[PDB]
Structure 1
Amino acid sequence: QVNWPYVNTKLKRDPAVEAQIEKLLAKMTIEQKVAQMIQPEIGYLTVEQMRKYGFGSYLNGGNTAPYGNKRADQATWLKYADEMYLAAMDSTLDGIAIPTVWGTDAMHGHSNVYGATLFPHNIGLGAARDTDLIKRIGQATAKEVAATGIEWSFAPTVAVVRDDRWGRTYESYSEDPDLVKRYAGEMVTGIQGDVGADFLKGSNRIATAKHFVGDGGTERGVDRGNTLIDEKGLRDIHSAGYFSAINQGVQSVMASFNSWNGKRVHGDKHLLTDVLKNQLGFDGFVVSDWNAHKFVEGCDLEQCAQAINAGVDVIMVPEHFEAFYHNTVKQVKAGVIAESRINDAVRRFLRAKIRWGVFTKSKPSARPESQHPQWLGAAEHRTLAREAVRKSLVLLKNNESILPIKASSRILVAGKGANAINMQAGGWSVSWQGTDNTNSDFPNATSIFSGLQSQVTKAGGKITLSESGEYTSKPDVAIVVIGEEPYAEWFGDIELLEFQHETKHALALLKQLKADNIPVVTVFLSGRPLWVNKELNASDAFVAAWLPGSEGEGVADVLLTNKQGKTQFDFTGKLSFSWPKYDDQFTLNLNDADYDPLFAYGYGLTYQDNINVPVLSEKTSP
């Protein structure tokens, strides 16, 4: 057998909290216990249903917003939170007064909420190599979540991605488990507070580390695919983030969509109980992913004893929660789910709600952390995100030191991504895919063109925006902003590594500018390295900017001099994913036996280098 380390070494239980739990459990019926374990979503839940059942939690799925209103005032969010809170404190119909909690996914800030600060996606945060930065982003994120009356946020994502074909590659900090391990505990403590006197106090939120486990190791990077690896590899490559997150006392863990050697993780008792709970020693609660239970053998949308028996404590059933609730009760009464199992699930979940202060705090709109609407999209947070943007950029090529550009130059800005905030933000940004977003969906955000314009104008230079690369006066330099369209999950799964393999539209723009003898600085937006030898050859400089988020001016901060013509910020980012030399290097990872990357893990030029990148082979595999 494979031995996993015990990693819950810091958080000690609170005896007063445990006494309350035991007292509560002793008086609860089977029905009240099961209610705590079921999680409806606001697109399908009514206040009357909450009064009737007293569900343990409910989900902000991000597709609906409170009362159906696409955008909504703080008072509207807090009114909804109060209505649900009072419905659950009403023991009239279900016979008990256990306060519910609201949960939300926080992909890069409070990212499904209109007006929220959008931080760079994880891959670029990985490039930054800055653990203190990560902790501060967690702190900012807790405040923005608190400002909407939500107690529980899903973050960090600790996937370690080994095949970049996966549509969720950008949600991972690195292909390297050591980097993810360094980061995970910082995000957990940033959100929840450090283990100690401030643990879960004030604006601190309950956190969820996702996803357990191996979703970044599926064959061919298929989303929700099959992870083929022995147990030691599962432990040493894919679980490193959980070691530090559990050690820092993360309150919740979310189970994963993928399979491990042919078995769905959500139904695997060995993973979710024996490994996660018994060996690693996780003392918090396991939450399932969105209708993930339906894919477990023998389960469906309205029933899944297997997942509950495997070690899932809270079931995310956004739509079918009512039928799922009644079915689960009948299964406990039939004896096919042990009362001891239900008791343990409720213990672990109440241990989180009670210790966070659910009985001690007032109703949502009256809590101290609800009195600060400015926290949502706060200037201080946008300043933090802008710093993250600067540190996330990786300079791949800078021939003849064309960067940094004098701010007083005449600059042309071109490419589809030049003034498109939806491209710089990527998926999980107000909407799911990000495709339908326009610039007005991001108030107070700044596009890359806008950031450049601001600084060039201040320096007395001239700037022009033209996506197609048209100009009146021939510029000194063209900054071309190009990249992937936004995507989330399986919509982003690819089979070919070549950028825009079907159209090569951006390449034609680059070549057009080169043929006119205009120097070219490419700013590449993507959720992953891609095979871009051709585009690199058509560029004098080439910057991997990943998916920088709302603060586009961080790009100008690095690429441009100040008004005096001096460097203001140098590049500091280093690759956290290996960059492919050939279009078929699908699994190119640090420490591989045959490791032949174009640019290795840890690579990143700075203005102190005087290195040229020569013309590269443009041959593609058959």
Structure 2
Amino acid sequence: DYVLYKDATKPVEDRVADLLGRMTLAEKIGQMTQIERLVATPDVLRDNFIGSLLSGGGSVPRKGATAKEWQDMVDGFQKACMSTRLGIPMIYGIDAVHGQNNVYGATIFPHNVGLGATRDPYLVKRIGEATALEVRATGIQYAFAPCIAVCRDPRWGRCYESYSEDRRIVQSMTELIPGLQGDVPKDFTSGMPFVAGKNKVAACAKHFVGDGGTVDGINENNTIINREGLMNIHMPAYKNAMDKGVSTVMISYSSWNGVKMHANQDLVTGYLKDTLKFKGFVISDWEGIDRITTPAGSDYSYSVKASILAGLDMIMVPNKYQQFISILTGHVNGGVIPMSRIDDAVTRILRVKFTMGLFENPYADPAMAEQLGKQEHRDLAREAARKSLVLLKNGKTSTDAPLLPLPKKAPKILVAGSHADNLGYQCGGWTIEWQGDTGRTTVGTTILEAVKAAVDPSTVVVFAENPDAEFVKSGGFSYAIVAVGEHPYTETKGDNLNLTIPEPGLSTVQAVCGGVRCATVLISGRPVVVQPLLAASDALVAAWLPGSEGQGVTDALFGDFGFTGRLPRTWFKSVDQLPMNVGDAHYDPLFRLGYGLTTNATK
């Protein structure tokens, strides 16, 4: 007879209700399971009724795989899922945190800390629209972004994934959501999940909650603060996400006053679902429930019981799916976990799938392949990189002539430094590989290539990665551009207590600037000990992690556009002042939040 749930013309809540009622326990638990592509097989997806798949950082079909190879891989998996009794399509997720970053040839936008320096929410909304098209170009429909953490201590390895230490800026940057998912209707009800169509993707606000406020910036550790402080610093952005229809929310590994977020029913069910009225589904982090205990994974049975009762809806296992499914089934059969909780989770997961049109368009669009790395997107990234640059110093003394903007025509100039010709360093973490990489890992323009593309044909450009002092003095250069900074890092490997750039870095700046007027470009994911660098150079620019379009840096260096960026974080004098944020009593910074010198166009 007539099957309601398959009727595309019926309202979403009806299709969900009709489908839920036909499902067996095995099929329901299947929808709550997300596994890595590395352990997926057509048989596994079919026999276990899997509901979702993902690619962790660096998990790709092949190195250098084209957009069509990605589409074929995703469709292959979807084929299996659609061949099940009920034909429920799977949803594929990936970390597209600054462009479709796991993919070769995808446009790489500046990381969030830099985007905060632009104070331009409209720009970020456009990046969201471009990112969605590039994710859809590879057949993927779900992005694990944006991270709306409020980094309160730069020693944290993920501070660069945070827009600012000021929650007001983070709130305005939630405009990324409507860019990724599409604008919500006028009749929209805060808390409902929303996705416009096949050229948009479901978004994910992470990590709930207080992930950027851990002690000493230790990744995944404990956030010690009172409820009121939690509610006015770390929670605000989540309410904004609700008003914009964010489809899902990911739970943090961190704990609040000793309680693991992955087991906190007060905040997950009590606040997020019952108070904020969130109607999308809640997903865990990678092996998030395993780390509820210590050691991790030492009592998986308890992990499943605690997280599911706490209120999670989908579990990013992501490898040992047999144990997860077996243990969860046991708890239900034993009455330890009520069927209503299961039904609630599956209802939320299906609501999102039906709303985004998954049942009507389960496969990839071969025509979208041309969207990967298109010039219009690169021009946008270029504009973003340029607006994210913060000019900290322009002339050694107040009576010195301004070094920037530099003239495009000069007899001979010098480009030096470890970061002057290294695309990987320029992109930082979450680029191609999980931790990022060194060298030419994808398609883009380095700072050296940008300079050569900008100067007058009569200008002689000489490159030297680490020149000694007399090479510089006898070279007869008009000026030099030196680029140095941090190396790529992600998550815990990013936790740093000293916050000083690696060598050679300071020595290169000293050797070069000692011989000729120099403009120093600092590449980093956060503020670092800068005094020495500041003392040696005539001009210093904070470029953060600009991404693949290096011409964004030179557009401002040679005067095509003026500097407009402003500090999104507080720049400390020394690490023992930390934590130190705008508002504190001991607030004595080297540069205050909002600081930034400017210039006007034309060299």
| 1:401 pairs with 2:402 | yes
- Residue 364 of structure 1: CA displacement? 1.3
Q: Is the CA contact 1:122–1:170 (under 8 Å) kept in the aligned structure 2?
A: yes
Q: In the alignment, which residue of structure 1 is the partner of 2:573?
A: 581
Q: In the alignment, which residue of structure 2 is the partner of 1:21?
A: 16
Q: Is the CA contact 1:64–1:70 (under 8 Å) kept in the aligned structure 2?
A: no
Q: In the alignment, which residue of structure 2 is the partner of 1:619?
A: none
| Equivalent position to 2:58, from 40, 43, 63 | 63
- Residue 297 of structure 1: CA displacement? 3.5
| Equivalent position to 1:292, from 270, 274, 288 | 288
Aligned length in residues: 572
| Equivalent position to 1:280, from 264, 276, 280 | 276
Q: In the alignment, which residue of structure 2 is the partner of 1:140?
A: 130
Deviations 1:566-605 (A, max 9, x none): x310001000001112342221211222211111100000
Q: Is the CA contact 1:180–1:240 (under 8 Å) kept in the aligned structure 2?
A: no
| Equivalent position to 1:114, from 104, 124, 138 | 104
Normalised by the length of structure 2, the TM-score is 0.92
Distance in 2 (alpha carbons) for counterparts of 1:96 and 1:364: 17
| 1:209 pairs with 2:193 | no
Q: Is the CA contact 1:169–1:527 (under 8 Å) kept in the aligned structure 2?
A: yes
**Structure 1 pair 495–53 and aligned structure 2 pair: CA distance change class (3 A):** same
Q: In the alignment, which residue of structure 2 is the partner of 1:552?
A: 550
Q: In the alignment, which residue of structure 2 is the partner of 1:481?
A: 483
Runs of 5+ in structure 1 lacking a partner?
A: 1-13, 561-566, 610-622
Runs of 5+ in structure 2 lacking a partner?
A: 1-8, 187-193, 396-400
Distance in 1 (alpha carbons) for counterparts of 2:71 and 2:115: 31
Q: In the alignment, which residue of structure 1 is the partner of 2:264?
A: 268
Distance in 2 (alpha carbons) for counterparts of 1:373 and 1:553: 25
- Residue 510 of structure 1: CA displacement? 1.9
Amino acid at match of 1:601: L
Deviations 1:103-146 (A, max 9, x none): 11111111111111110000000001100001000000000000
Q: In the alignment, which residue of structure 1 is the partner of 2:183?
A: 194
Query: Any idea what SS the aligned residue of 1:155 has?
Result: coil
Q: In the alignment, which residue of structure 2 is the partner of 1:353?
A: 353
Distance in 1 (alpha carbons) for counterparts of 2:393 and 2:567: 13
- Residue 479 of structure 1: CA displacement? 0.6
Q: Is the CA contact 1:284–1:349 (under 8 Å) kept in the aligned structure 2?
A: yes
Q: Is the CA contact 1:498–1:583 (under 8 Å) kept in the aligned structure 2?
A: no
RMSD: 1.8
Matches within 5 A, 1:102-181: 102-181=92-171
Amino acid at match of 1:106: A
> How many percent of aligned residue pairs carry the same amino acid?
44
**Structure 1 pair 169–123 and aligned structure 2 pair: CA distance change class (3 A):** same
Q: Is the CA contact 2:94–2:143 (under 8 Å) kept in the aligned structure 1?
A: yes
Q: In the alignment, which residue of structure 2 is the partner of 1:373?
A: 369
Distance in 2 (alpha carbons) for counterparts of 1:279 and 1:543: 44
| Equivalent position to 1:429, from 425, 428, 431 | 431
Q: Is the CA contact 2:57–2:430 (under 8 Å) kept in the aligned structure 1?
A: no
Distance in 2 (alpha carbons) for counterparts of 1:199 and 1:308: 26
Query: Any idea what SS the aligned residue of 1:463 has?
Result: strand
| Equivalent position to 1:222, from 209, 215, 218 | 218
Q: In the alignment, which residue of structure 2 is the partner of 1:53?
A: 48
Q: In the alignment, which residue of structure 2 is the partner of 1:35?
A: 30
Matches within 5 A, 1:214-613: 214-297=210-293, 300=297, 303=301, 304-361=304-361, 363-365=362-364, 367=365, 370-399=366-395, 400-409=401-410, 410-435=412-437, 437-439=438-440, 441-443=441-443, 445-458=444-457, 460-469=458-467, 470=471, 473-500=475-502, 505-516=504-515, 518-560=516-558, 567-607=559-599
Distance in 2 (alpha carbons) for counterparts of 1:136 and 1:481: 29
Q: In the alignment, which residue of structure 1 is the partner of 2:189?
A: none
Distance in 1 (alpha carbons) for counterparts of 2:195 and 2:491: 33
Query: Any idea what SS the aligned residue of 2:15 has?
Result: helix
- Is the deviation greater in 280-289 or in 69-78? 69-78
**Structure 1 pair 80–511 and aligned structure 2 pair: CA distance change class (3 A):** closer
Amino acid at match of 2:416: A
Distance in 2 (alpha carbons) for counterparts of 1:599 and 1:534: 15
Distance in 2 (alpha carbons) for counterparts of 1:608 and 1:552: 20
Normalised by the length of structure 1, the TM-score is 0.89
Q: In the alignment, which residue of structure 2 is the partner of 1:10?
A: none
Q: In the alignment, which residue of structure 2 is the partner of 1:11?
A: none
